[PDB]
């Protein structure tokens, strides 16, 4: 969880040196630890070692692999893992769908990203805030202000206390087209933010009010 790949590797080597067969959960943990630091080869080696010792992969292992590959944009590995899942027969939860969405988003395949989005909407499962966050990010990246603003006004109507991600993505997309009026009108409601402190701090610091040594 903390992305301490070196410590996880040290613990794995220590527990292997004492004739202890590692469990599937421990291997999943070390795999996700290696994937945090973009060390894909070590994560794949650990995943391969899982089968050697008999510790079969679980759904958590596939989720960790999908997230690690999606962060780096390795969508070929994403589709390989999806094929592995489909031939394994494991049901695909929202994690698989949104991991695929963000993998295609980071890989730049916007059209295939929205194709997978509508494929997910067709079958089942309710998209969480993460799925709409991913679709908003992929829309903002591919120079689409209209879809971004539509999704922004649709999602904020659910009284969900919109997160930092949506505000930063909106600021980015508005700065793409030099929509200084939109940036200012978002900042006016962003500055106060009576509910949370993180939004207030980031909104004050982006404008330059916190650049001082005592204010940083």
């Amino acid at each position: 969880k903390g992305g301490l790949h070196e410590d996880a590797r040290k613990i794995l080597q220590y527990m292997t040196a004492k004739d202890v067969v590692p469990s599937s959960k421990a291997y999943t943990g070390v795999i996700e630890a290696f994937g945090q630091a973009a060390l894909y080869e070590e994560a794949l080696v650990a995943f391969n070692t899982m089968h050697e010792v008999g510790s079969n992969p679980s759904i958590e292992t596939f989720h960790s692999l999908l997230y690690s590959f999606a962060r780096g944009g390795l969508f070929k590995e994403s589709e390989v893992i999806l094929s592995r899942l489909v031939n394994s027969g494991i049901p695909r939860n929202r994690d698989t769908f949104n991991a695929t969405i963000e993998a295609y988003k980071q890989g730049g395949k916007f059209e295939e990203a929205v194709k997978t989005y509508v494929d997910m909407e067709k079958s089942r499962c309710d998209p969480d805030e993460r799925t709409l966050e991913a679709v908003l990010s992929v829309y903002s990246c591919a120079r689409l202000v209209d879809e971004c603003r539509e999704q922004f006004e649709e999602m904020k109507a659910s009284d969900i206390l919109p997160s930092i991600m949506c505000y930063c993505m909106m600021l980015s997309v508005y700065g793409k087209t030099e929509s200084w009026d939109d940036v200012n009108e978002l900042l006016e409601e962003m500055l106060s933010n009576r509910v949370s402190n993180i939004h207030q701090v980031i909104g004050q610091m982006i404008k330059g009010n916190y650049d001082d040594d005592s204010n940083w």
Binding site: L44, N48, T49, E52
Partner: peptide, 17 residues
Amino acid sequence: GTGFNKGDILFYHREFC
């Protein structure tokens, strides 16, 4: 007569591709 003189590595480790 005939009785004389008493008569797995490299697996689960393939290239991921």
